[PDB]
Design a protein around this nucleic acid. Structure first.
Ligand SMILES: [Mg+2]
Ligand SMILES: [Mg+2]
Ligand SMILES: [Mg+2]
Ligand SMILES: [Mg+2]
Ligand SMILES: [Mg+2]
Ligand SMILES: [Mg+2]
Ligand SMILES: [Zn+2]
Ligand SMILES: [Zn+2]
Lengths: 49, 43, 273, 180, 49, 440
RNA sequence: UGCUUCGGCACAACUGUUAAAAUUGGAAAAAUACAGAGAAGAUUAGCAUGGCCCCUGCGCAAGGAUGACACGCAUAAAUCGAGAAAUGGUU
RNA sequence: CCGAACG
RNA sequence: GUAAGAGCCUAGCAUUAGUACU
């Protein structure tokens, strides 16, 4: 859970940011996945954003 | 699927097509359908 | 149109010649080209220039030069600690930081009661000695030929060696800023009045009390932090005994009133009686 | 990554020519060369810029300065060697071809300052590779047509659908248009 | 005064465009009901190439 | 309600004398006029007629000088101006030379009753009462001992060569430790000095000396009985693998792998490095001697296993395949003909090395588990390894694809695994929980 | 230096991005080793699209493997109600 | 007439 | 066989701000 979590979270957030700068605007679907993932991480500042 | 949207120191790169040219406008004179000349007539 | 500057970083002269170098630098935080200002605070001074954007300055109410807060002149940590406010959320990345900036363009520090903590931990007169030449790096190595003429201080560096590596971004944001770290460890010791090995000594000595403060006035002082067992005046020493009924109440009274509180104006010291 | 363009190369062929000229005079001045050898070598430098510099590779319009200096050389050499004077080095009448290259340089100073300021700006500001508009050139003509064509069909699709119809069958309509 | 020989001093930075101005109420007339008929006369068969 | 941000900025217009005059009445003199029109600021910090006249005198005197129109002028001085505390700085520069040259201990806590036995014998002298159990090795069945005393997880333990009566392990607590197996099961004495956790263990031939590499970049060789440090070699490189040559002649020399990809063959006799092998490309993980100290094959983070000769600074042979994986642990098979390489892909590959003929024996490969030191059975029927979940795996020799024995040993990573050379079915397991178990 | 009632006046007025440095940090490259190329069978020309990807270029050209990337691998549950039956409580 | 880059 | 990139070690561009005690 510690600092191995945090870097898996860095990896999956960079994955999400990459996907979102690519595909985010032109085809929906993606922000729901990104936001539900950030909700799974119980990060609600991030998911609200 | 989605076009690029085109929203808008300054860069000092000067294009060749952006050098001064046609630096004054032609206006319509008396005889080329100027606006004050055309109120005068019944079109 | 005018720098946002610590009024220490303008020196004693009511008149300032300052050089205005528009697009003269990159903000040391937002990495942005901005208008730099350069000037000599006074005759013993060097030429200081602004270090950050004007916006990045007035965000955290810090000087454009010293990056210290504008109201109290203490690093952004010490003020954020006394402000009790959250860690900086602002993005460290510059893509992030510029995105935050271009957002805030298109659409909390002025309304606080003066914090006694910051006021207690600040300099009375201005640190003009911060506006002065660096130390002659050729005088250090013993190889300075410029003699007394050197515009650089002919002294050696007398500095903490963990210090002298300070980071702009960290002094602006508030993360591992060794100077404010030193300062908070200072206040940690001064907030550390030794509660002695004797657990049962339930009395606090109140010394340096000027005579116009009466025993019921110091009672009005100390009643808040716990029950008083007995308060005892002696103006000969200008001092007082105060015993409580519970140790933790005298601990409260030491901890809150150890950093030299002033009862009705008198600069008074506390000790474990 | 080390392929330089016509601005760099025109600048350095022009600097090679000024080196040649300056060096001709420095040879005269060190004493290694006569005044007659200096004059003949300067007129040689100015008549042989297509042989001595390679500057026409980076601005091929300066073939007309080279043709003009060749015509000037034919005329001057003909009128020079009339009589016993004959057929070799020794003619140093260099002001005609010198002024040909001075006209070249006056007219190309603004072009080259532009080009070199652009090179310096890309070096110091970086390439502005960001949302500046690409022309529709002959190689993009057919692909841009289809861009525009599909965008037009997409316009129409979104306007043709009734109010509560899932607006995502447009991709299959675009596939039907490809098929048709 | 700036040196006339001073080349361009700062490199240009790339950011994604911000959110924009805030949204505006969509002041529409009542939804007009899609029949199931007009749901079927906009069923687009899949394209078999 | 204010104009600027920190005050009010207002345009002004004066005549230029006034800015400068006031700026220099204060600037130079210290005290000047307030620009607000309110008083003055701060605290304060010609020519004549006889002197004027005397200068006129010297002028007319230089005029009275005789001029000789015949004489040229010469230049006499001709460039006189051109040809032209210290104590604190002396002390500071002394401190600079000091911090410059300075820019350019370990002890023992004995834990037995008495360090020697009844016959003047040191406790490391092998007891006679123990003999070899069975010519065949057997699989572990139950718990026997649990060697605890490690404040954090250990790196690995090793059985004392020949007799296997005691074992020495290095820990992430910073210490090397020695524990008895056959009698008391006690920690005999602690030996510390590593500035952080120690990295591995490799004992001397007869058990008198002991070399320990540390995460402090120091390789310290100390005693077994007396517990004194013999020497400590460091160069500023992080060490991973220690081994002295298995020959009894050159046991004074050891091996040292460092994440600088170099293998320093080190003199414990002289103290300075005897040989330097720099033919590796990535971090130095594992090294094992083969052919009776003749050949040493080294494991690298560039995924290559490189066999070399002792004394040959040119690598003998390199083996690095697209399916090769990180090699943290090498194990020397009893026959001296095989090596067990631990592959980061959760496998133990068996490589053949017989008389310089090294090949992949990709048929005899063990897999199924998840830097575990591989342990070899004394007769060669068993292979043991650590795994992710605290599990010790035992594979049969004829069937490395038939998982023989699964042992739930520890709660966390179990890296150290060693078959007792004197016992038949007692094993040693050591994990990253500070727990070590004995199997029987 | 003029002018001088020889007392003195007049004139002239604030350089320095202050370093011969000190740190200080970030960088492309090199080797190594990794591994090493669009489309649908193979082999292959490309021109695009999108952008916090750039490089070469004077570039509103052209090129960089169609410059790269992306490009979906949809373990994108795109998911659920209808009814009979039958069984469970209560009378 | 007349030569360079790129693909 | 392209030639792309990830990284490792070692790897010379920009900066002038900041150093306290009742
Ligand atoms: Mg294309
Ligand atoms: Mg292209
Ligand atoms: Mg091709
Ligand atoms: Mg492309
Ligand atoms: Mg093409
Ligand atoms: Mg091509
Ligand atoms: Zn300031
Ligand atoms: Zn000096």
């Amino acid at each position: 859970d510690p600092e191995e979590l945090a870097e898996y979270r860095l990896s999956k957030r960079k994955q999400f940011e990459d996907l979102v700068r690519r595909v985010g605007r032109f085809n929906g679907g993606v922000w729901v996945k990104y936001a539900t993932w950030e909700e799974q991480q119980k990060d609600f500042r991030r998911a609200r954003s | 699927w989605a076009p690029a949207i085109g929203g808008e120191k300054p860069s000092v790169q000067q294009s060749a097509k952006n050098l001064p040219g046609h630096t004054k406008l032609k206006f319509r004179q008396t005889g080329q359908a100027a606006e004050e000349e055309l109120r005068a007539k019944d079109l | 149109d005018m720098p946002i500057v610590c009024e220490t970083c303008l020196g004693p002269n009511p008149f300032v010649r300052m050089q205005r170098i528009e697009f003269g630098g990159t903000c040391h935080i937002s990495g942005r080209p901005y208008t730099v200002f350069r000037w000599r605070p006074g005759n013993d001074a060097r030429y200081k220039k602004t270090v950050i954007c004007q916006e990045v300055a007035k965000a955290k109410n810090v000087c454009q030069v010293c990056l210290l807060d504008l109201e109290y002149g203490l690093p952004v940590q010490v003020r954020d600690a006394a402000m009790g406010v959250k860690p900086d959320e602002e993005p460290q990345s510059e893509v992030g930081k510029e995105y935050k900036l271009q957002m805030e363009a298109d659409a909390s520090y002025a309304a606080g009661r003066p914090n006694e903590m910051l006021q207690k931990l600040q300099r009375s007169q201005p640190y003009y000695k911060r506006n002065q030449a660096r130390v002659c790096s050729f005088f250090a190595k013993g190889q300075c030929t410029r003699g007394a003429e050197c515009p650089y201080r002919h002294e050696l560096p007398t500095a903490d060696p963990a210090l002298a590596n300070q980071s702009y971004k960290d002094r602006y944001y508030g993360t591992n800023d060794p100077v404010a770290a030193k300062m908070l460890k200072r206040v940690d010791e001064l907030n550390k009045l030794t509660p002695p090995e004797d657990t049962s000594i339930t009395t606090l000595y109140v010394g340096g009390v000027d005579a116009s403060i009466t025993e019921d006035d110091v009672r009005d002082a100390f009643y808040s932090f716990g029950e008083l067992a007995s308060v005892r005046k002696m103006d000969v020493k200008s001092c007082a005994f105060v015993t409580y009924t519970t140790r933790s109440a005298a601990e409260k009274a030491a901890e809150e009133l150890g950093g030299n509180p002033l009862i009705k104006g008198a600069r008074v010291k506390l000790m474990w009686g | 990554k080390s392929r330089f363009g016509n601005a760099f190369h025109l600048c350095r062929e022009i600097l090679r020519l000024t080196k040649l000229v300056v060096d001709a005079n420095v040879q005269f001045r060190l004493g290694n060369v006569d005044a007659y050898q200096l004059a003949d070598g300067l007129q040689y430098i100015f008549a042989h810029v297509g042989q001595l510099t390679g500057m026409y590779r980076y601005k091929y319009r300066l073939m007309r300065q080279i043709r003009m200096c060749k015509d000037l050389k034919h005329l001057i050499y003909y009128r020079f060697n009339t009589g016993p004077v004959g057929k070799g080095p020794g003619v140093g009448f260099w002001a005609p071809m010198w002024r040909v290259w001075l006209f070249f340089l006056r007219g190309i100073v603004p072009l080259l300052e532009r080009w070199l300021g652009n090179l310096l700006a890309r070096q110091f500001e970086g390439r502005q590779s960001k949302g500046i508009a690409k022309t529709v050139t002959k190689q993009r003509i057919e692909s841009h047509f289809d861009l525009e064509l599909r965008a037009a069909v997409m316009h129409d699709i979104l306007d043709m659908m009734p109010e509560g119809v899932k607006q995502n069958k447009a991709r299959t309509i675009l596939q039907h248009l490809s098929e048709a | 005064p700036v040196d006339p020989l001073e080349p361009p001093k700062f490199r240009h930075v790339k950011v994604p465009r911000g959110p924009g101005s805030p949204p505006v109420p969509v002041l529409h007339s009542p939804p007009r009901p899609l029949t199931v008929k007009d749901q079927q006369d906009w069923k687009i068969p899949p394209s078999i190439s | 309600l204010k104009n600027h941000f920190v005050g009010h900025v207002e345009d002004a217009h004066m005549h230029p004398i006034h800015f400068e005059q006031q700026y220099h009445n204060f600037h130079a003199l210290g005290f000047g006029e307030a620009p607000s029109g309110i008083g003055v600021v701060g605290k304060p910090v010609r020519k004549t007629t006889q002197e004027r006249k005397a200068e006129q005198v010297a002028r007319a005197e230089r005029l009275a000088a005789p001029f000789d129109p015949s004489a040229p002028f010469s230049l006499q001085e001709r460039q006189p101006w051109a040809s032209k505390t210290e104590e604190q700085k002396e002390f500071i520069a002394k401190a600079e030379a000091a911090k410059l040259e300075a820019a350019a201990g370990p002890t023992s806590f004995f834990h037995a009753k008495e360090e020697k036995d009844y016959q003047g014998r040191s406790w490391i002298l092998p007891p006679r009462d123990k003999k070899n159990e069975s010519d065949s090795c057997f699989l572990p069945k139950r718990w026997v001992h649990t060697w605890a005393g490690h404040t954090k997880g250990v790196n690995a333990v090793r059985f004392f060569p020949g007799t296997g009566h005691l074992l020495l392990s290095a820990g992430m607590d910073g210490k090397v430790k020695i524990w008895d197996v056959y009698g008391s099961g006690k920690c005999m004495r602690t030996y510390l000095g590593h500035s952080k956790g120690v990295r591995d263990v490799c004992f001397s031939n007869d058990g008198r000396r002991f070399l320990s590499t540390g995460y402090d970049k120091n390789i310290r060789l100390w005693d077994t009985e007396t517990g004194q440090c013999i020497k400590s070699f460091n160069t500023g490189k992080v060490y991973y693998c220690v081994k002295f040559h298995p020959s009894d002649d050159k046991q004074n020399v050891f091996m040292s792998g460092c994440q600088d990809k170099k293998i320093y063959q080190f003199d414990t006799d002289t103290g300075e490095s005897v040989q330097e092998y720099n033919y590796h490309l990535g971090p130095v993980n594992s090294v094992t001697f083969i052919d009776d100290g003749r050949q040493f094959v080294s494991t690298s983070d560039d995924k290559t296993i490189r066999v070399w000769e002792f004394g040959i600074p040119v690598q003998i042979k390199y083996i690095a395949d697209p399916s090769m994986h990180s090699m943290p642990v090498v194990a020397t098979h009893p026959s001296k003909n095989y090596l067990l390489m631990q592959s980061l892909d959760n496998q133990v590959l068996t490589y053949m090395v017989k008389d310089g003929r090294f090949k992949s024996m990709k048929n005899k490969t063990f897999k199924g588990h998840n830097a575990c030191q591989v342990g070899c059975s004394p007769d060669g029927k068993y292979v043991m390894s650590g795994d992710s979940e605290g599990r010790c795996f035992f594979w049969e020799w004829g069937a490395p694809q038939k998982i023989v024995r699964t042992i739930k040993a520890h709660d966390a990573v179990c890296i150290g695994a060693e078959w007792n050379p004197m016992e038949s079915s007692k094993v040693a397991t050591c994990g990253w929980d500070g727990l070590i178990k004995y199997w029987d």
